[PDB]
Amino acid sequence: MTRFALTGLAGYIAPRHLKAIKEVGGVLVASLDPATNVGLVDSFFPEAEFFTEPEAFEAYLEDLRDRGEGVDYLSIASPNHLHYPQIRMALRLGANALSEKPLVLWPEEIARLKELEARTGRRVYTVLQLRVHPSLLALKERLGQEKGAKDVVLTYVTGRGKWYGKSWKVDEAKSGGLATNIGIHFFDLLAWLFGRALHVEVHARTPTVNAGYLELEGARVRWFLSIDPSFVPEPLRRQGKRTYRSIAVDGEEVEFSEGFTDLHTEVYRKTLAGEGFGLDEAAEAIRVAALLRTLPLSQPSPENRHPFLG
Amino acid sequence: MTRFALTGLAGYIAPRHLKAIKEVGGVLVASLDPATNVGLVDSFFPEAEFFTEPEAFEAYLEDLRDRGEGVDYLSIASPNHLHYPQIRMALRLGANALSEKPLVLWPEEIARLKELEARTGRRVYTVLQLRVHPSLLALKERLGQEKGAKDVVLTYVTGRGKWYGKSWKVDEAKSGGLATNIGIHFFDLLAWLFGRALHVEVHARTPTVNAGYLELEGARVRWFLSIDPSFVPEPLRRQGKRTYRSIAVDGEEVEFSEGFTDLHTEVYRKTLAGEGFGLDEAAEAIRVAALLRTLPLSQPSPENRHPFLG
Amino acid sequence: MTRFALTGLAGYIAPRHLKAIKEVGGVLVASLDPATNVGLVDSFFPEAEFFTEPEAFEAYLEDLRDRGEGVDYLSIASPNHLHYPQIRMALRLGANALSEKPLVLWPEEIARLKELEARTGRRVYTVLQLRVHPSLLALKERLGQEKGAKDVVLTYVTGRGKWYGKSWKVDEAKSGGLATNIGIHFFDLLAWLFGRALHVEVHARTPTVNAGYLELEGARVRWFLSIDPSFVPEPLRRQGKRTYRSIAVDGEEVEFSEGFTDLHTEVYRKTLAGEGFGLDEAAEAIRVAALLRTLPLSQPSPENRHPFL
Amino acid sequence: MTRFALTGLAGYIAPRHLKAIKEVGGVLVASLDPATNVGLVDSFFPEAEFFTEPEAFEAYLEDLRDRGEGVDYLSIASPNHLHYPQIRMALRLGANALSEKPLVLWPEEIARLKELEARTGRRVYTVLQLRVHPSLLALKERLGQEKGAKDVVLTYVTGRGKWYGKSWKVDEAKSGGLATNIGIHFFDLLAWLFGRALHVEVHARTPTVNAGYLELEGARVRWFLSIDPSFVPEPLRRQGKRTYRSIAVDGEEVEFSEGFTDLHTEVYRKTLAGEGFGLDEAAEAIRVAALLRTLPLSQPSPENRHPFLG
Numbered sequence A, B, D: 001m002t003r004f005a006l007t008g009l010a011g012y013i014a015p016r017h018l019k020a021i022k023e024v025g026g027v028l029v030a031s032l033d034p035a036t037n038v039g040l041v042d043s044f045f046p047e048a049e050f051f052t053e054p055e056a057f058e059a060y061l062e063d064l065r066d067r068g069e070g071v072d073y074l075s076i077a078s079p080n081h082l083h084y085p086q087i088r089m090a091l092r093l094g095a096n097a098l099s100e101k102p103l104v105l106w107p108e109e110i111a112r113l114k115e116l117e118a119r120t121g122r123r124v125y126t127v128l129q130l131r132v133h134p135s136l137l138a139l140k141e142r143l144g145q146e147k148g149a150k151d152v153v154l155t156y157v158t159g160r161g162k163w164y165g166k167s168w169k170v171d172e173a174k175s176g177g178l179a180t181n182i183g184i185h186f187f188d189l190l191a192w193l194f195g196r197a198l199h200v201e202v203h204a205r206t207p208t209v210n211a212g213y214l215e216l217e218g219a220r221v222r223w224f225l226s227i228d229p230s231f232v233p234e235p236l237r238r239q240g241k242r243t244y245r246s247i248a249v250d251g252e253e254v255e256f257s258e259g260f261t262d263l264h265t266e267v268y269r270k271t272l273a274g275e276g277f278g279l280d281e282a283a284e285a286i287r288v289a290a291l292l293r294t295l296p297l298s299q300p301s302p303e304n305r306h307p308f309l310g
Numbered sequence C: 001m002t003r004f005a006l007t008g009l010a011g012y013i014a015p016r017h018l019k020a021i022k023e024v025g026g027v028l029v030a031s032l033d034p035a036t037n038v039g040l041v042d043s044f045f046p047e048a049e050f051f052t053e054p055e056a057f058e059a060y061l062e063d064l065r066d067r068g069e070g071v072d073y074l075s076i077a078s079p080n081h082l083h084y085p086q087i088r089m090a091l092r093l094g095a096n097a098l099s100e101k102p103l104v105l106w107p108e109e110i111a112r113l114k115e116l117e118a119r120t121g122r123r124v125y126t127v128l129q130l131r132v133h134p135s136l137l138a139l140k141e142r143l144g145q146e147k148g149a150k151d152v153v154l155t156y157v158t159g160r161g162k163w164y165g166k167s168w169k170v171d172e173a174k175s176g177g178l179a180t181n182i183g184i185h186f187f188d189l190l191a192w193l194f195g196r197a198l199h200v201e202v203h204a205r206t207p208t209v210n211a212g213y214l215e216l217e218g219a220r221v222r223w224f225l226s227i228d229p230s231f232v233p234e235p236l237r238r239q240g241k242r243t244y245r246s247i248a249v250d251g252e253e254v255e256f257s258e259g260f261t262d263l264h265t266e267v268y269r270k271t272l273a274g275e276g277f278g279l280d281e282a283a284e285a286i287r288v289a290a291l292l293r294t295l296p297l298s299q300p301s302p303e304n305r306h307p308f309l
């Protein structure tokens, strides 16, 4: 029975973690969130300890550890800028970390975490559910059979209501900006499929749209990211869809929205089986996303312009 | 299409109000919550406006009024002490109010609300789902047949985890205390069935237990309230059950937990149909609960002592 | 005895408002702040009500109004995005408003307040302390005696520590951005002295520097604003100074640091006498600051580039 | 040059700590507060780091420690329940702690901190400025010359406006209650003069008044504590005084309000000189204050009743 603590319990994504912990036969020992709108927790783990103050949470988990009943994992569902320091808290307390994406905001934070693993005997893992999406695992096998770099069009639209622009998600110091907070999913998919980015361009940047181009070891990629649902293709909009997440490559197209929200238990299962996504796996997309925070806009060549900018 | 604005969107009970507004064919025009952990809202009303600052939400709703697009109803799912001033906001904005229980904390607030309903021509309503619970409607009908007052044992145990003690729920200025925040359900049930309280006693009053006695026009009632699930009767507790909500009238048992969390849409419907629970309906249980904040403890006679007290 | 309520009581700036209210013979009936380090209030108005919830503060003031004991002014010292909706509250409660700068963030908000003033017969005022100052007030009479366009270089560097970057003051939706949160003082001084901005350019807009160029009816202005103290001129910086606040008009300087934390009381007095700074006085700087946060960057000509760039 | 970090920078007492660090020739390296009303700091330590997130503050200080540049002291001016876990943070960072009163809330926390001191070779100190108040030091000397149990009337009135009741200071879980948050000063003065409390009674306990009776090894003590300035004696009220802090014993009375707010630098100097008030010194008043939280009210005998209750 794997022992978990959880940060960010009051949040949107937290119930998916509570479900994962239940489904892998784990127990939630304690949670942290400065907000107390967490009453849903009793329907999953009615005996879990709860803290509003991170310093009190830390002291409690240390007391559990300084006596043999420590947690095995800290699940981290706090705002992005808190992932790094809460992962360090976990490792120091003798727990593995399982952090939401992006694992951290900066490449310097990845480098420091690699050193800290070696001094604490624990490991840092991250939630990248696209890496367990059955359609994308199948695409990955297909693409591996083919020599040469591929040409890819990546379109990632996921609608967000008006609350998003009043939240931490649009504070770049907290979220990393749109290309990190939302785009890390696809920058990570592209690194997993096609390796390291040799060249990066950004062609459009507004509060709701970013678009650009990547030259990766295995592919040339035109990409478009939005949180404005008007960019969902019209035939799908008609049927009420608010998302469109598509990779077109090698003469095929895979739209990977189905089950996007139903893969957190599989990520937990892979992680507890020792097949999790660690620092080495997460680092490349974080490097790309971080470069994009400060990269100047450029004018795309026609070959490099995503079609939604045409 | 009834037009609603909602306060308390990030909270535990908010999704039941989103489901109710949906199911009655209403539209959520705008919501208010100082917390922004509200991403669930896009799965219901992906175009609703959102505010963290009450002053800005008010100015926005005042602008809508002034241009003939005012909201019809403010639904209120904020902490209890904010119900009164949020209902004052609804009324001044030219909207009706539908507030979670307890409707307000104090009888003086009920009295001032009556004045403001007269000044504004608007109405104040509240969510008391026990009044639409089919077993309790059935009970009320059977009691109408009967002559004389009844002897009643009311036992109300609903377990709460460790987060509750770190929330506004235990700040008596915010919540009104245990007998208000949780007990209002049953004080209101008893007022609805049995009328006004002629005499009130409190026999036990700790952070997790209140017990006492009421003499009502239609009943003598021994009551016990707890948020410690250890008080669930042993034959249910041994199975892991954490709630027990029972009214026993002249020795006949009605346990009413089933469907307790599945009646908000029916309250909303009754309200919109002119059958809502207004100030006059809610006032008596508020008067009882408010008395209980300062009523001195007394030693029960054996005939007035709830069985759980020994 | 003029009755006041105050918003933003916990904030850096509220003590000058407590002094003005005291000094002008007013009484503070109630205050609002989400935060609770407001104890200083006890040494001025030891009986004032206090609220952390805006809706409870509004209901309390509305009760007072309805029984004929309403406040006469709402003084507003909250973060900038709250000024507009708190002035709206003041007018709905039948009070005048006296707001910190910037009075509101957007010209559309000014227009709405003008409608609402007419509806309620109450007035919106703002604290423009540079306008009652001795050394800036000196200019306006002189300058005004001469004709011809002036050539102005405006430089303001006011160092801010690491806390600033973690506060609402860098959230553009809350503060209006650097030029507004720092700038607005001086854009208002410039509009006061030299009229409407007929051309506006922004040359730099980074998190610690905003710089640009204005042409006003009465002057051209090269301006530079920063909260990075490394831009304090070296003869001051070498001494450890972290601020520098200069307007040079046709080669003639005035530096501005001295009477800066100073003149809230006179502004209260003028306002109470019917000589306050209203929407019409405030609007132009608000229009310019709204452009300064929204216009695209452009590359300056040599002639139009502030020397510090 | 003694290196400090500070918690609670945006609050009421912090400016006194900034002044103290400056006056003892220290440097403030970094500060933590979730609130950002802190601009004052620039007039003292213009280059200090600042954090809103405790986990980021702790990671920053951990980095300093690891590269041989750790702070020497953590000064703690956060809410009272945070003192214990922030002192734990200091000790694990290899810093001494200098915490505002009360040092911690509970005797069990004192006991844990004694164990952690021994582990780390760092020390915990606290601000008890009455122990450096010249009038009280002079009184202590005068009393010493005697022998036999003293008879004491302690009256401690310190006015607070309406903001206090909407702050953390009235949340007993955060502040310890009135007898702890305000009262610790005088319980500590009494323990310093007269030793262990062998008998404790509480006679009144309202939001603005606590009163009771103690018998200590060296004195019997009738005490009264209020934040209602109406209890300042009329003659002092008539001249506008809002405090009255009086100890009457041995045929004299010492009123110790003068300079009560001007002794923080002296506490810092004593602490840096190795003459600070440690766990052993602070423990007894913490034990007494904690007992008073749960002690039921009793009816006083006339002899044991503070005069202000008569």
Ligand SMILES: NC(=O)c1ccc[n+]([C@@H]2O[C@H](COP(=O)([O-])OP(=O)(O)OC[C@H]3O[C@@H](n4cnc5c(N)ncnc54)[C@H](O)[C@@H]3O)[C@@H](O)[C@H]2O)c1
Residues within 6 Å of the ligand: A007, A008, A009, A010, A011, A012, A013, A014, A032, A033, A034, A035, A054, A076, A077, A078, A079, A080, A082, A100, A101, A102, A127, A129, A167, A181, B036, B037, B038, B039, D053
């Ligand atoms: N597909 C996915 O894998 C997916 C989807 C959504 C969000 N996320 C990620 O999950 C995280 C949570 O996002 P969300 O949408 O639930 O955001 P949210 O704003 O709904 O919830 C964030 C929670 O963090 C809490 N918080 C703030 N500071 C904290 C601290 N010091 N400790 C603990 N909790 C703290 C907030 O009070 C809040 O309840 C982010 O890292 C986000 O990128 C991932």
Ligand SMILES: NC(=O)c1ccc[n+]([C@@H]2O[C@H](COP(=O)([O-])OP(=O)(O)OC[C@H]3O[C@@H](n4cnc5c(N)ncnc54)[C@H](O)[C@@H]3O)[C@@H](O)[C@H]2O)c1
Residues within 6 Å of the ligand: A036, A037, A038, A039, B007, B008, B009, B010, B011, B012, B013, B014, B032, B033, B034, B035, B054, B076, B077, B078, B079, B080, B082, B100, B101, B102, B127, B129, B167, B181, C053
């Ligand atoms: N069976 C029932 O009918 C039932 C069950 C649970 C709760 N309730 C009631 O619903 C209300 C909410 O309880 P909850 O359990 O959801 O609590 P909660 O603590 O989960 O959520 C409360 C929400 O109110 C928000 N809030 C705080 N101040 C606000 C303001 N000024 N405006 C708008 N929002 C504000 C908080 O940020 C939070 O998201 C309470 O009145 C409670 O009694 C009813």
Ligand SMILES: NC(=O)c1ccc[n+]([C@@H]2O[C@H](COP(=O)([O-])OP(=O)(O)OC[C@H]3O[C@@H](n4cnc5c(N)ncnc54)[C@H](O)[C@@H]3O)[C@@H](O)[C@H]2O)c1
Residues within 6 Å of the ligand: B053, B055, C007, C008, C009, C010, C011, C012, C013, C014, C032, C033, C034, C035, C054, C077, C078, C079, C080, C082, C100, C101, C102, C167, C168, C181, C260, D036, D037, D038
């Ligand atoms: N020289 C000047 O005249 C001068 C100097 C500084 C600031 N200001 C202005 O004064 C105002 C205060 O800035 P500050 O420096 O005190 O920042 P601040 O962050 O120190 O003060 C913040 C106070 O406002 C509060 N607040 C947030 N929401 C509120 C609400 N809905 N109602 C009332 N209060 C609320 C916050 O809790 C905070 O405690 C701003 O408009 C700023 O532009 C003017």
Ligand SMILES: NC(=O)c1ccc[n+]([C@@H]2O[C@H](COP(=O)([O-])OP(=O)(O)OC[C@H]3O[C@@H](n4cnc5c(N)ncnc54)[C@H](O)[C@@H]3O)[C@@H](O)[C@H]2O)c1
Residues within 6 Å of the ligand: A053, C036, C037, D007, D008, D009, D010, D011, D012, D013, D014, D032, D033, D034, D035, D054, D076, D077, D078, D079, D080, D082, D100, D101, D102, D127, D129, D167, D181
């Ligand atoms: N005479 C004295 O020695 C004296 C006088 C006043 C207060 N105090 C003590 O000083 C402490 C502060 O009291 P105050 O009056 O300044 O209260 P306050 O409410 O004015 O200030 C409290 C500060 O703590 C901050 N805070 C909350 N959580 C924090 C955290 N995790 N880390 C750091 N900061 C955090 C708050 O945001 C706030 O700015 C308390 O322990 C109090 O008992 C002592």
Ligand SMILES: O=C(O)CCC(=O)C(=O)O
Residues within 6 Å of the ligand: A101, A158, A181, A182, A185
């Ligand atoms: O909806 C998406 O594609 C992104 C989900 C996510 O990771 C987020 O919202 O943070």
Ligand SMILES: O=C(O)CCC(=O)C(=O)O
Residues within 6 Å of the ligand: B158, B181, B182, B185
């Ligand atoms: O569970 C219950 O019976 C009470 C639900 C409720 O109203 C509450 O938690 O506020």
Ligand SMILES: O=C(O)CCC(=O)C(=O)O
Residues within 6 Å of the ligand: C158, C181, C182, C185
């Ligand atoms: O320091 C300055 O010059 C600007 C003051 C100001 O208005 C602010 O800080 O918001």
Ligand SMILES: O=C(O)CCC(=O)C(=O)O
Residues within 6 Å of the ligand: D158, D181, D182, D185
């Ligand atoms: O004023 C006093 O005597 C006590 C000071 C205070 O508030 C405190 O110590 O928290």
Ligand SMILES: [Cl-]
Residues within 6 Å of the ligand: A050, A051, A052, A053, A056, A057, B166
């Ligand atoms: Cl906690």
Ligand SMILES: [Cl-]
Residues within 6 Å of the ligand: A166, B050, B051, B052, B053, B056, B057
């Ligand atoms: Cl808002």
Ligand SMILES: [Cl-]
Residues within 6 Å of the ligand: C050, C051, C052, C053, C056, C057, D166
């Ligand atoms: Cl309030």
Ligand SMILES: [Cl-]
Residues within 6 Å of the ligand: C166, D050, D051, D052, D053, D056, D057
């Ligand atoms: Cl931080």
